[PDB]
Amino acid sequence: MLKIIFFLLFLIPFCFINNMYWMVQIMMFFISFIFLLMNNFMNYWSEISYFLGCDMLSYGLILLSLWICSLMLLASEMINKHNNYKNLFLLNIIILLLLLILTFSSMSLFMFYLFFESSLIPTLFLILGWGYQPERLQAGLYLLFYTLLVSLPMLIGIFYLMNKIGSMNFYLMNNFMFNYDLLYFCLLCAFLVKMPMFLVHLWLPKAHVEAPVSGSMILAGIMLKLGGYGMLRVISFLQLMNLKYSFVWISISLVGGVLVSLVCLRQTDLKALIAYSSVAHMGIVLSGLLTMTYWGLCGSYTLMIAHGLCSSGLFCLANVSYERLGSRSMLINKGLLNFMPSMTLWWFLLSSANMAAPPTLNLLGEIYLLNSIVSWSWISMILLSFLSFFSAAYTLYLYSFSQHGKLFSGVYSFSSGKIREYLLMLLHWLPLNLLILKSESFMLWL
């Protein structure tokens, strides 16, 4: 595992040498290939190195980050085009990636938290540094302060577990089952925030709408998963307490998913709409996760991988349109099929994946969470039908409205799509399908 870490560390100096922007991604893509060869993992931890291991769960999430963090560099070519502190920008991602790799590769719960939040600050610099609109302040704080407010109490819950278990290592924790009501709320309300839950999602539409394209990728790509990944490790020893209060979370997320889907239909901003679509699906992920069944756990792991690639993908396309039309509102963006017809194909495939269209990896995960939820209670069929219905209602509205109609009138002349953009879109979607072939690996982490 140290092979990855020391590779990244020695790539830090590449931020300082000039005319090395493009030589960075290749080193970032090549390491993904090298990491892609060392899959021999199992449910239990493997490749121990001083505190760094990796199981099938951590592997897929790590590999997802390397892929996504590599696409960030492709997407944010404008930073290179205007030399807008590109060297500092590169160092932000290389640091950020290292924090993620450690976070998932950490074997002890305290470490996971140590790099859990620490990744936030590199993200926070990203929003303020390279965001256009003035609201990146008022969205910079929300991201920082919702997270800190609920992560600091989690730190107490972590330490209280040493004095009982005597250690942080995940395997040793699973041997215990705790009965204290507050402790349950000090290790899940901290992750329920970052999922996010419907009622505490108020930061998500602000952070995503204002953050740059690259920040949108990682915020939607890996930050929403750290909440999901964290839960998968800490419901193991909260099984008893999970049964007394699960019905509160399931109802909120399920009803939260439906209500947000209606909110999606009344949006008029591409960035906002995609961001609210994240809350909709993340409600199903959390819902199935708390069902605790074998299906709900394997499925939740799957959907987190698939959704991140998609929602990250859809943020590419919004940036492409915004870069030229200059406005992210739906009213400006119309009939793009008649300006950039080649682009509209990628709009569809990424859009179709978001609505659980086949043969994507997204449908495999969504079939499963749906199974666990139904088994949990037949009453869940009511909204789970509504949520899947409306989860396509806004996706069509997102795609159709922005691509189909007659062209805008005031738009000034702008460049057409470039090869970089097409290559970026392929790398987002094409794995999202081929992964179905080897779901063997990225599914059975239990």
Partner 1 sequence: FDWDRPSYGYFSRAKVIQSAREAPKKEEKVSYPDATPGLPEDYPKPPAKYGSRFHWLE
Ligand X SMILES: CCCCCCCCCCCCCCCCCC(=O)OC[C@H](COP(=O)(O)OCCN)OC(=O)CCCCCCCCCCCCCCCCC
Give contact residues for ligand X (rule: CB under 6 A). 16, 87-88, 91
Which stretches of 305-401 are assigned E, i.e. beta strand? none
Instruction: Compute the distance between CA of residue 443 and CA of residue 218 in angstroms, rounded to an integer.
Output: 22
Contact 220, 141 (CB under 8 A): no
- SS3 per residue for 349-375: HHHHHHCCCCCCHHHHHHHHHHHHHHH
**Count of residues making up the chain:** 446
Q: Are 223 and 266 in contact (CB under 8 A)?
A: no
CA atoms within 13 A on the CB side of 106: 21
- Smallest separation, CB 430 to ligand X (Å): 34
Q: Which of 380, 389, 370 is nearest to 303 (CA)?
A: 370
**DSSP code, position 168:** -
In the complex, least distance from residue 172 CB atom to partner 1, rounded to whole angstroms: 13
Tokens 């996010």 -> residue: 196
How far apart are alpha carbons 412 and 50 in whole angstroms?
58
Q: What is the smallest separation between the CB atom of 113 and partner 1, expressed in angstroms?
A: 11
236 contacts partner 1 (rule: CB under 8 A):
no
Of 238, 224, 243, which is closest to residue 300 (Cα–Cα)? 224
Stretch that binds partner 1, among 105-113, 184-192, 274-282, 425-433 (CB under 8 A): 105-113
| Stretch 363-402: interaction string toward partner 1, x if CB under 8 A | ----------------------------------------
For the bound state, the minimum distance from the C-beta of residue 176 to partner 1, rounded and expressed in Å, comes to: 18
First to last CA, the chain: 21
Looking at beta carbons only, is 129 or 335 nearer to ligand X?
Answer: 129
Range in contact with partner 1 (rule: CB under 8 A) among 53-61, 104-112, 253-261, 356-364: 104-112
Q: What residues pair up with 108 in beta bridges, in sequence order? A: 169
- CA 217, chain centre distance (Å): 8
From the list partner 1, ligand X, none, pick the one residue 88 interacts with, judged by a Cβ distance below 5 to 8 Å according to partner type. ligand X
The option from ligand X, partner 1, none interacting with 168 (CB < 5 to 8 A, set by class) reads: partner 1
Concatenate the DSSP letters of all residues of 23-38 into one string: HHHHHHHHHHHHHHH-
* DSSP 8-class letter at 235: S
**In the range 22-61, which residues lie near partner 1 by CB under 8 A?**
50-51
Residue nearer to partner 1 on the CB measure, 113 or 386: 113
Q: Quick one: 122 or 283, whose CB is closer to ligand X?
A: 122
Min CB(91)–ligand X separation in Å? 5
Residue whose C-beta lies closest to ligand X: 87
> Phi and psi for 305 in degrees, rounded to 5?
-60, -50
364 binds, options ligand X, partner 1, none, Cβ within 5 to 8 A by partner type = none
Q: Give the helix/strand (H/E) hosting 47.
A: strand 46-49
Q: Taking CB under 8 A as the rule, does residue 111 contact partner 1?
A: yes
For residue 279, the SS3 value is helix
CA distances from 331 to 13, 252, 267, 334, 409 (A): 44, 32, 11, 7, 11
Verify binding: residue 110, partner 1, rule CB under 8 A.
Answer: yes
Q: Which does 108 bind (CB under 5 to 8 A by kind): ligand X, partner 1, none?
A: partner 1
Could you say which of ligand X, partner 1, none residue 111 binds, taking C-beta under 5 to 8 angstroms by partner kind?
A: partner 1
The entry of partner 1, ligand X, none near residue 91 (CB within 5 to 8 angstroms by kind) is ligand X
Gap between the Cα atoms of 359 and 219, Å rounded: 26
Using the minimum distance from each CB to ligand X, give the nearer residue, 5 or 265.
Answer: 5
124 and 115 in contact (C-beta within 8 Å)? no
Residues 168-227 that bind partner 1 (CB under 8 A): 168
Judged by beta carbon distances under 5 to 8 A according to partner kind, the member of partner 1, ligand X, none in contact with residue 251 is none
87 interface partner picked from ligand X, partner 1, none, CB below 5 to 8 A per type: ligand X
Q: Which stretch binds partner 1 (CB under 8 A): 106-114, 215-223, 287-295, 434-442?
A: 106-114
- Least Cβ distance, residue 207 to ligand X (angstroms): 24
Please pick, from the candidates 39, 80, 87, 108, the single residue that binds partner 1 as defined by CB under 8 A: 108
Q: Provide, rounded to whole angstroms, the least separation between the CB of residue 98 and ligand X.
A: 12
Residue 123 CB neighbours (<10 A) = 22
CA 193 to CA 203: how far, in whole Å?
Answer: 9
Cβ 407 to partner 1 shortest distance, Å: 59
Stretch that binds partner 1, among 89-97, 107-115, 242-250, 436-444 (CB under 8 A): 107-115
- Let me know: does 112 contact 76? Beta carbons within 8 Å: no
Contacts to partner 1 by CB under 8 A: 50-51, 108, 110-111, 168
